């Protein structure tokens, strides 16, 4: 029986754009009038915050706050604009203000609520990626929100799911875990005896669909899998 359903945030319950938005509207307020264009800024800000992450994948946690430090330290030596001060506060106001759920969001999260836990992962930090659910209104529809911080390790480290099973208080094999990442998401999952649902809204990762038990598009179809899972027996299902 799936007792309990864990979805990530990037790609599952936040829109890319809508990251990508957040970050341009962070990278405009630290530049002001500086001659740089912010589209170009937010370009080399994510490779850099991307490779920082990768190279933290599975290992103890670190601290978000000083990860992107240092990242900016790096682009205002790169580029020649003054370091900003409180770019935490930027960060916060920013993630307060923009960004967007996928449309089915909300509606999945409500229909799953009353039947099964359903929980977030999250893999950045505690404070900025729950302030960001909560200013998109979600935070309280969670039964659990687990974070790499609370885990002590981030993805794909066995911890994070781990603290996410026990806040739900079943084993892996009651649960399965959405997310867009094959190895992170899906393989990291199912370590734990998760089943794993791969999310491809844009059917662009096909050469990494074996690594999950089931793919979808959208989160709609996640509901139908989990239906499909518990009325094994029943009369409605035959
Ligand atoms: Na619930
Ligand atoms: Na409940
Ligand atoms: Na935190
Ligand atoms: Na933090
Ligand atoms: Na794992």
Request: hydrophobic share 40%; glycine share 8%.
């Amino acid at each position: 029986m799936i007792r309990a359903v864990f979805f990530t945030s990037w790609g599952t319950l936040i829109s890319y754009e809508g990251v990508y938005k957040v970050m341009f509207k962070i990278m405009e307020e630290v530049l002001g009038d500086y001659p740089l264009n912010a589209a170009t800024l937010l370009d080399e800000y994510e490779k850099l915050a991307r490779e920082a992450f990768d190279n933290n994948a599975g290992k103890p946690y670190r601290p978000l706050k000083d990860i992107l430090e240092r990242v900016m330290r790096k682009l205002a030596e790169k580029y020649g604009f003054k370091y900003p001060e409180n770019l935490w506060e930027i960060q916060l106001r920013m993630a307060g203000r923009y960004g967007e759920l996928y449309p089915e969001v909300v509606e999945v999260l409500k229909s799953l609520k009353g039947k099964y836990h359903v929980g977030v992962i999250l893999n950045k930090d505690t404070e900025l990626s729950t302030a960001h659910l909560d200013a998109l209104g979600i935070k309280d529809l969670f039964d659990s929100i687990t974070t790499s911080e609370e885990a002590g390790f981030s993805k794909p480290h066995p911890r994070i799911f781990e603290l996410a099973l026990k806040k739900a208080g079943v084993k892996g094999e009651k649960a399965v875990c959405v997310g867009p990442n094959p190895v992170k998401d899906a393989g990291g999952s199912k370590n734990l005896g998760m089943t794993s649902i791969l999310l491809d809204r844009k059917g662009e990762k096909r050469e990494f669909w074996d690594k999950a038990d089931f793919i979808v598009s959208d989160l709609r179809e996640v509901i139908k899998i989990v239906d499909e899972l518990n009325g094994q027996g029943s009369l409605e299902h035959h």
